Each structure stands twice: as structure tokens, then as C-alpha cells.
Amino acid sequence: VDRWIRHAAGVERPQLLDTETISMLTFGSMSERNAAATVHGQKAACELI
Amino acid sequence: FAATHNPWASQAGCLSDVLYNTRHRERLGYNSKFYSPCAQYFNTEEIIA
Amino acid sequence: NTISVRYLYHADHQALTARFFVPEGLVEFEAQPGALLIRMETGCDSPRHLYISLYLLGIRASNVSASTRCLLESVYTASAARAALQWLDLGPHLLHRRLETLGCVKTVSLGITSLLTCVMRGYLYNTLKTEVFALMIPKDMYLTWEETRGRLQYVYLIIVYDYDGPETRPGIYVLTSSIAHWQTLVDVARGKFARERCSFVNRRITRPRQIPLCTGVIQKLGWCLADDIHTSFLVHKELKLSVVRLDNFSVELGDFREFV
Amino acid sequence: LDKILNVEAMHTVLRALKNTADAMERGLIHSFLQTLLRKAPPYFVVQTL
Amino acid sequence: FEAIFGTFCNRLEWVYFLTSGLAAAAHAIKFHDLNKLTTGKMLFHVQVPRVASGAGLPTSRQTTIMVTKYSEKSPITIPFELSAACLTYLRETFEGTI
Amino acid sequence: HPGFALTAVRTDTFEVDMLLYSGKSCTSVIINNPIVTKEERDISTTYHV
Amino acid sequence: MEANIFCTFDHKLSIADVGKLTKLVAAVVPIPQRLHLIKHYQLGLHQFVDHTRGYVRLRGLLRNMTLTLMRRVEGNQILLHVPTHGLLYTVLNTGPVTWEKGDALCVLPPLFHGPLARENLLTLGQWELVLPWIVPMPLALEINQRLLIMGLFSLDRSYEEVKAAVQQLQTITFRDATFTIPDPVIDQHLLIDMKTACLSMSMVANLASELTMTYVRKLALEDSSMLLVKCQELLMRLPARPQHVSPDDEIARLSALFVMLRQLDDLIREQVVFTVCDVSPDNKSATCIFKG
């Protein structure tokens, strides 16, 4: 069911990243790949029930 | 003058409270690098102190 | 006034130079000061040792581009590499014992026997502190695990040992990184060489004979600023080749550290 | 140093009189203006008269 | 052949914190460091005006309110490299050629 | 449409030119003589004033 | 590189505020940035403070921090000096452990002694000064053995079973001094260390020679001793021995095993920083050859 969630969301795991890349997450590190063309600049949003 | 216009937002321990408090989030772990625009509003120590 | 000792000396030299005679068949490309010297442990008595340039290791390296290997194949066809492939290629996944880093050149004399100075510690530079010679890593061999430039990156020379095919074709990895703790540098090496760490188990699954060894070896070479990092261009014997330059590179030759 | 503190106590008495005197001036302004408040009917009354 | 042209030097007009009009807000005064052991927690007996009143509400009996302030240092530092060649040629004079 | 209303908060970053007007002789500042230090390298000599 | 580091303060010093820092002269001070004028907010281990209350993560983040010896309290600045390789400078004791001449020393994260002297010795609006311990090498690594045995022990156990060994494991003893150790338990960094640990245990189990692994049993009937009686109990689970093999194979079967003996012990190994020479009679200062 979790694979169906990642598929329906469209956000597939990048092989759970490198294990050292997970080790750097506790210090904080970028996860998003940079978008290619970005004429509109930085994007942001948030969500609340 | 409503006691809580957004019961699932203003309440302590609501879904947005645990979702956005830095304390309730770090108890589950998170990447510090990502910005959380709503999180600045729900914090206790940022506000109560 | 009297006893003006300051006038007597022209300049001090912190660098620990050494003069090594070299065969004329290896002087090519080596004539540029920025190149590693690496003694080889030949099994023959005459001679038991044989200096080789780091570029000579790339004719057999796997990770280097094959188009560069087509160029290097036309370069070293002389008394040197014809014996080097006869010896170091014969070695069964053993290089850190066969090889021994010996710093980089300061100057290269010509002649039929090309003696050359080579510092084993400190900055390498032209005499009278004039021109500042720079180290030259081969283009494809250079890499960084972190694409971000650091404030100050030490350089290391890992020697990967693949165990896939019956004939091992070890890779060579110069790399700069701001990391300075070997206990963490092996940890970042753990997840990146997953095919190589799998390969060390992959020999035991097939051939109990002949012991598998290192997935790599790490040793200090020296520090360099991110602004000192460069990727320029080099020419010798008309065969042009771009290279990853390093400017003010102090030499600090640490001992090899074997590990899996 | 004690003789310097003599001059310090003298200046303390000087400001104790000066600031009380200027406060007496502000009190005379505040009191006379307070009398003007009681003395002055609202304009719409005076216009009706 | 081919033409060449020389010293198109980058002229740099000088500036000063003192010549600037922004210093009018400043009360800058160069002064030797005392190695003060932090004496920068200055006190201030700031005199406070008051007013007499005929109202029965009390007026303050205490002239001049206390004020504590601090001297928040913000040091700056500028590296500038000099090549060892430029130094070794600077003091020495080989007197071999022009 | 489900039962979820949304407060989609979103911060924005704007470039801003500004101006400021301190009074004359506002903050006071004092400075000392520069203290040069001679950092040493065999190939060059940086100087941190 | 730089030979020295400087710092700037916010909240102003008093008599005690500068006296506690003059007490810390010639003592270890980690920095993470090595800029010529670091801010005090970046100074110390306190920047890595963690509400999750970890420890091993503080150690791994400590692994990359540069060490810098303290010197000269000019006032309103730390004036750190950057140690040079291969020489010596005096170093004050910090960690509550007795020192002896010639022992190796290493950096370890602090932990409360038990009674807890709780001497922060410096504080501001919230920021503090947490100086990592300088401890003798066997003590520096045995705690890593405790955290590693704590990691392997956690698997497949009831909570009373999980904490049963902990009453002995977290109460380490050394030179009369005793220490209780709060632990991350599971902080991923212990897990990634466990992965290379068991991977080393596998090859060490597999690279062993047929006679080398049998050597204890070959000695078992050969001799009788209480250490061997303690040796005997571990190996058995509930007399014959064989011998073959050509001599040349052992030079290979043993050689690669030495690399695993490093790779297995590397994770409990820590880089040395100090080597004491002239111990002070008062048990405070101690000059040490070699630095970071």
C-alpha cells in the first residue's frame, strides 16, 4: 500500500538515497533536486486542515 | 470572540500543532533546511518567552 | 651594521627536496613539475625499484576515459611502460604495497638520464621564489564527493579494487575534500562504493582461493584552498590534454591506510 | 575625593531645586490650562447663544 | 603585425568615514584600548522632568531615573596577501641589469 | 470536494530599497589602532590587519 | 590555514565572567569554522544541542570539528591558537579522570558524573560553553565498546531485558571514578556503525584459517588453566581436531584477515590528539607532545 501511495503521489523514493545522505539529514541537507527552467523564481506553499 | 475559530489549528496537540511545532516535529525528526512558513506561528518558546 | 647575517642568506627552503635520476623513456609529460613520483616494487633484482609517473597508472586504470587511454597508449611506448605492464599489471590486486608515493617534481633536467628534483614535503616552487609550480591531476581521475567547494580541502589517492571480472582492472581516484577525519571518510566511502563492497563479498561467493583485500586505500597528500582548485590545459609532445590543476599545494605525504 | 563628594552633594541640591522649580513652571501651565478647561463651554453651545 | 595598448589602469577615487556625511550621526573618536576588563556597563543618572499638580494623585518622589547601557564591540579584520617573490625582490637589489 | 477547508499560508520575499534617519550625535563610537598580524606560509605571507 | 582564531562577545564580562575564562587558559576548545574571527554563537559544542537528547550524534559531529588550544585572555575575546602537528603545548585537565604520564588522550563528548557538579562556568541569554572531555585512550574506546554492545544487545528483547544489562553497561568504572552514560540507544549513526561492524564480524569469521579457528580446541586438551576454563565456556554450545593444509596458504589467509581486524576495530578506535609528558604535581596542567 505504501508503494501505491508513492505512485499516486508521484514522489518515488530515490532508492532511499545514499545511507550517508541520510546521515547528513540530521545535520540538515537539501533533498529537492533543482528544477531546470525556473523563469518564475522560488516557489513556496503550505497546508492546513 | 469564538473560543477557537480553528479547533484543529489553535488547539495544543492538534494535528497542525504536532505537524508544525519544532519540538513535536524534532521528536519525529525533520530536515532543518526546509522552510516551514506556518511553523513560525505555532511555536511555544518562540512566542511564550 | 656588523654581523649582518640577514644579508648573507638569500632565501630559506622549508621544502624537503630529493634528487632522483629517471630513465629517458619516462621523462615525457613528467617534464612538467606537477606530477607524482611513485616507486614500484619490481620483483626482479635489476632493478627492484622503478619510479613511475601517476599518468603511467592511467593506461591500465578502468575509470579513466577510454579515449584518453587511446592517447596514453601512443605516449609511453618505450623502455618504461613496456616493462611496467610486464610487472605491475601482473600483480594480483596489489598496488599499495607495490607503489610508494614520493611527492612531486620541482625541476627536471634533460639528457639521456633525466635527473629531477622532487619535494617530499612543503610547497614545490621554482628557485628564488619566482614562479610557483602547480600540481597536475589527470582530468578524468579528479572528483569530489561533495560538489560544493570547501573552505580547505585535503587531497587523497584512493585505489579501488574491483572483483567482477577474472582480470582485475583497479581504478584510481584523486579527490579533494574538506573532510579531515579518517573515521568518517571511511563511512562516506561505505555507501558510495556499494558495488565495490559487494565485490569484496563477490569474490568469496566464487573463488575461495586467493584472498580478497582492500576496496580502497587512503593516505594524506596535502591541503589546498577551493580557490586554488583549477581545471586547465596542458601540452607535451603535441599530444594535448586538459588537466585538473592545483595551485599552492603544500605536500604532506601520509602513510597508506588499507581498509575494506 | 571626599571633598569632591562635597561638590557632588552641592550639585545634588542644585538639581533638586532646579528640577522642582521647572516642575513648578509645568504645574503652573498645567493648572492654568486645567482652569481653561473648566472655564470654556463647548462651541455648539456658544454658537447657539 | 598587430597593435597593442597599455595601462588602462582602473582609477579608484578615495573615500573616508570622516568625509562622509553619515558620520554626522556618529560621535567617532579614536582612543587607545585600556584592556578595560569590560568597564562598558555604563550607568546613567538621566534626569527626568516632572510636573506639579493640584490633583490628589501622587507625583514621583524620585528625580532622575537610572539607565544601564553597554559597549557592544564589533571588530573587523582584512587579510591581504603578499607573494614571497615580491618581498624577496623588494628588500634585495641584485644590481645585475636595468 | 471533501470536508477539508484549507488555510494555505505562503510567505513571500520582496526586494526592498530603504532609507533611515538617525539624529545628530546619536550613537557614539570609538576605535583603536590597527593590530597587524603576520600569518606565515613558505610560498607567501598574508597579513590580517 | 590560520595560526590563530579570535572571537567576539555579546553580553558583557564582569569579574567572575572573565575570571572563569582565565581559569580555562591553555585548555582545549573545538571550533567548527576556522575563520579568523569566529562568532561566539559558533563557539563550543553547544551549537549541536539536541532536544532529542542524543550523544553518539554529538560524537560524530564532533569528529570533524577542529581542535584549538586556549591562550591569553586579553578580555572580550577568546584568542584561540591553532595547534601545530607534531609539537607540544600545556593542556589543563577538564574531564573528571585522573591522568598518568605518557598515556594517549582523545576527545570524547561530556556526560554527567552522577552527583553532577553542573558547573556551566559560562552562560548568556541561553548560550553556554560545553568543553569536550580529554580522556585517556582506553577509557575513550571502552565507552565506544559499551555503546556498540548496547546497539547489538537492543535487538529482539523485552524492555526489562533491554535494560537488564544496562545497569552494568551504563555504569562504567575506571580509576575509582564511576560514570553513568545516557544513551541515544538508536540514532542511526549507531546503526550504520553496526552494519560495518557485523560486516566485519562476518569476514573475520570467514577469513579464519581452518587451523587458526581450531587453535583453541587444539590447545584445549593440551593445557588446563582457569582463563582457558573461561575460554572453554564461551566457544561451546549444548575433542577431535584435524590438521592439513600446505604452509604457503597461511601467508594469504592470515594477511587479509589483518585488514578486517583493523576495519572491525576502527569504529571503536579514535584518533589520538595528546601524549602526556610532564604531569603537574597538582593534577591540573599537562604538556603533551603531538596535537591535532
Side-chain angles (χ1 to χ4, degrees), chain G residues 245-260:
Chain G
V245 177
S246 295
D248 190 15
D249 297 339
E250 297 298 326
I251 205 62
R253 301 296 300 274
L254 181 68
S255 176
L257 194 145
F258 286 174
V259 180
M260 307 305 304

mmCIF file of all heavy atoms in Angstrom, chain G residues 245-260:
data_model
loop_
_atom_site.group_PDB
_atom_site.id
_atom_site.type_symbol
_atom_site.label_atom_id
_atom_site.label_comp_id
_atom_site.label_asym_id
_atom_site.label_seq_id
_atom_site.Cartn_x
_atom_site.Cartn_y
_atom_site.Cartn_z
ATOM 1 N N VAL G 245 46.525 -28.813 5.120
ATOM 2 C CA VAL G 245 46.830 -27.512 4.518
ATOM 3 C C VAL G 245 48.323 -27.317 4.260
ATOM 4 O O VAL G 245 49.163 -27.570 5.131
ATOM 5 C CB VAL G 245 46.270 -26.366 5.388
ATOM 6 C CG1 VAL G 245 46.647 -25.012 4.806
ATOM 7 C CG2 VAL G 245 44.755 -26.491 5.522
ATOM 8 N N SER G 246 48.657 -26.863 3.051
ATOM 9 C CA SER G 246 50.034 -26.537 2.710
ATOM 10 C C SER G 246 50.466 -25.239 3.398
ATOM 11 O O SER G 246 49.652 -24.335 3.604
ATOM 12 C CB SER G 246 50.188 -26.402 1.197
ATOM 13 O OG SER G 246 49.964 -27.642 0.546
ATOM 14 N N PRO G 247 51.747 -25.130 3.771
ATOM 15 C CA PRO G 247 52.197 -23.955 4.544
ATOM 16 C C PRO G 247 51.982 -22.612 3.866
ATOM 17 O O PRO G 247 51.734 -21.619 4.559
ATOM 18 C CB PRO G 247 53.694 -24.230 4.747
ATOM 19 C CG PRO G 247 54.064 -25.165 3.644
ATOM 20 C CD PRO G 247 52.863 -26.035 3.445
ATOM 21 N N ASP G 248 52.084 -22.544 2.536
ATOM 22 C CA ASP G 248 52.084 -21.247 1.866
ATOM 23 C C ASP G 248 50.744 -20.529 1.987
ATOM 24 O O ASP G 248 50.706 -19.295 2.000
ATOM 25 C CB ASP G 248 52.459 -21.415 0.394
ATOM 26 C CG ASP G 248 52.708 -20.087 -0.303
ATOM 27 O OD1 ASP G 248 52.880 -19.064 0.393
ATOM 28 O OD2 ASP G 248 52.731 -20.066 -1.552
ATOM 29 N N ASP G 249 49.641 -21.276 2.089
ATOM 30 C CA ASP G 249 48.325 -20.644 2.066
ATOM 31 C C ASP G 249 48.109 -19.734 3.270
ATOM 32 O O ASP G 249 47.366 -18.751 3.175
ATOM 33 C CB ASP G 249 47.229 -21.711 2.001
ATOM 34 C CG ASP G 249 47.300 -22.543 0.733
ATOM 35 O OD1 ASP G 249 47.898 -22.072 -0.257
ATOM 36 O OD2 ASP G 249 46.754 -23.667 0.724
ATOM 37 N N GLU G 250 48.753 -20.036 4.400
ATOM 38 C CA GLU G 250 48.538 -19.252 5.615
ATOM 39 C C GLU G 250 49.037 -17.818 5.477
ATOM 40 O O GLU G 250 48.504 -16.918 6.136
ATOM 41 C CB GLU G 250 49.214 -19.932 6.803
ATOM 42 C CG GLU G 250 48.647 -21.302 7.127
ATOM 43 C CD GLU G 250 47.182 -21.249 7.523
ATOM 44 O OE1 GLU G 250 46.767 -20.250 8.147
ATOM 45 O OE2 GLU G 250 46.446 -22.208 7.206
ATOM 46 N N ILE G 251 50.059 -17.582 4.648
ATOM 47 C CA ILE G 251 50.564 -16.220 4.495
ATOM 48 C C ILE G 251 49.519 -15.338 3.825
ATOM 49 O O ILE G 251 49.515 -14.115 4.012
ATOM 50 C CB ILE G 251 51.904 -16.216 3.728
ATOM 51 C CG1 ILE G 251 52.717 -14.966 4.076
ATOM 52 C CG2 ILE G 251 51.686 -16.296 2.219
ATOM 53 C CD1 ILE G 251 53.094 -14.873 5.539
ATOM 54 N N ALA G 252 48.616 -15.932 3.048
ATOM 55 C CA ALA G 252 47.498 -15.196 2.476
ATOM 56 C C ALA G 252 46.284 -15.207 3.400
ATOM 57 O O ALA G 252 45.695 -14.155 3.667
ATOM 58 C CB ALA G 252 47.132 -15.778 1.106
ATOM 59 N N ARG G 253 45.921 -16.383 3.924
ATOM 60 C CA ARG G 253 44.714 -16.495 4.739
ATOM 61 C C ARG G 253 44.795 -15.623 5.984
ATOM 62 O O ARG G 253 43.764 -15.168 6.492
ATOM 63 C CB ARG G 253 44.475 -17.954 5.131
ATOM 64 C CG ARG G 253 44.304 -18.902 3.952
ATOM 65 C CD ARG G 253 43.058 -18.573 3.151
ATOM 66 N NE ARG G 253 41.856 -18.670 3.969
ATOM 67 C CZ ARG G 253 41.184 -19.797 4.180
ATOM 68 N NH1 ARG G 253 41.597 -20.931 3.628
ATOM 69 N NH2 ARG G 253 40.100 -19.792 4.941
ATOM 70 N N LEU G 254 46.004 -15.383 6.489
ATOM 71 C CA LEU G 254 46.172 -14.508 7.642
ATOM 72 C C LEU G 254 46.257 -13.040 7.242
ATOM 73 O O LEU G 254 45.773 -12.173 7.978
ATOM 74 C CB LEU G 254 47.424 -14.909 8.423
ATOM 75 C CG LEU G 254 47.739 -14.113 9.689
ATOM 76 C CD1 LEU G 254 46.694 -14.379 10.759
ATOM 77 C CD2 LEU G 254 49.134 -14.436 10.202
ATOM 78 N N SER G 255 46.851 -12.745 6.081
ATOM 79 C CA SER G 255 47.205 -11.366 5.752
ATOM 80 C C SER G 255 45.969 -10.496 5.557
ATOM 81 O O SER G 255 45.859 -9.418 6.153
ATOM 82 C CB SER G 255 48.079 -11.338 4.498
ATOM 83 O OG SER G 255 48.350 -10.005 4.101
ATOM 84 N N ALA G 256 45.028 -10.946 4.725
ATOM 85 C CA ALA G 256 43.818 -10.164 4.501
ATOM 86 C C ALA G 256 42.976 -10.066 5.764
ATOM 87 O O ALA G 256 42.226 -9.098 5.936
ATOM 88 C CB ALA G 256 43.000 -10.771 3.363
ATOM 89 N N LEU G 257 43.087 -11.056 6.653
ATOM 90 C CA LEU G 257 42.348 -11.012 7.908
ATOM 91 C C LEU G 257 42.795 -9.844 8.775
ATOM 92 O O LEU G 257 41.997 -9.310 9.555
ATOM 93 C CB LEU G 257 42.517 -12.339 8.653
ATOM 94 C CG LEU G 257 41.588 -12.664 9.825
ATOM 95 C CD1 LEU G 257 41.290 -14.149 9.846
ATOM 96 C CD2 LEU G 257 42.205 -12.249 11.143
ATOM 97 N N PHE G 258 44.059 -9.424 8.647
ATOM 98 C CA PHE G 258 44.541 -8.281 9.416
ATOM 99 C C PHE G 258 43.810 -7.001 9.038
ATOM 100 O O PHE G 258 43.615 -6.125 9.889
ATOM 101 C CB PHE G 258 46.046 -8.097 9.212
ATOM 102 C CG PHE G 258 46.891 -9.106 9.936
ATOM 103 C CD1 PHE G 258 48.263 -9.137 9.751
ATOM 104 C CD2 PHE G 258 46.319 -10.015 10.811
ATOM 105 C CE1 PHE G 258 49.047 -10.059 10.417
ATOM 106 C CE2 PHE G 258 47.100 -10.938 11.481
ATOM 107 C CZ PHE G 258 48.465 -10.961 11.283
ATOM 108 N N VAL G 259 43.412 -6.864 7.772
ATOM 109 C CA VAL G 259 42.680 -5.672 7.360
ATOM 110 C C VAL G 259 41.309 -5.631 8.020
ATOM 111 O O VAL G 259 40.833 -4.565 8.432
ATOM 112 C CB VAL G 259 42.576 -5.624 5.825
ATOM 113 C CG1 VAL G 259 41.807 -4.391 5.384
ATOM 114 C CG2 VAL G 259 43.962 -5.651 5.204
ATOM 115 N N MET G 260 40.649 -6.787 8.130
ATOM 116 C CA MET G 260 39.375 -6.846 8.838
ATOM 117 C C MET G 260 39.546 -6.583 10.328
ATOM 118 O O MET G 260 38.649 -6.016 10.962
ATOM 119 C CB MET G 260 38.713 -8.204 8.616
ATOM 120 C CG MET G 260 38.572 -8.598 7.161
ATOM 121 S SD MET G 260 37.713 -7.364 6.172
ATOM 122 C CE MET G 260 36.179 -7.191 7.080
#
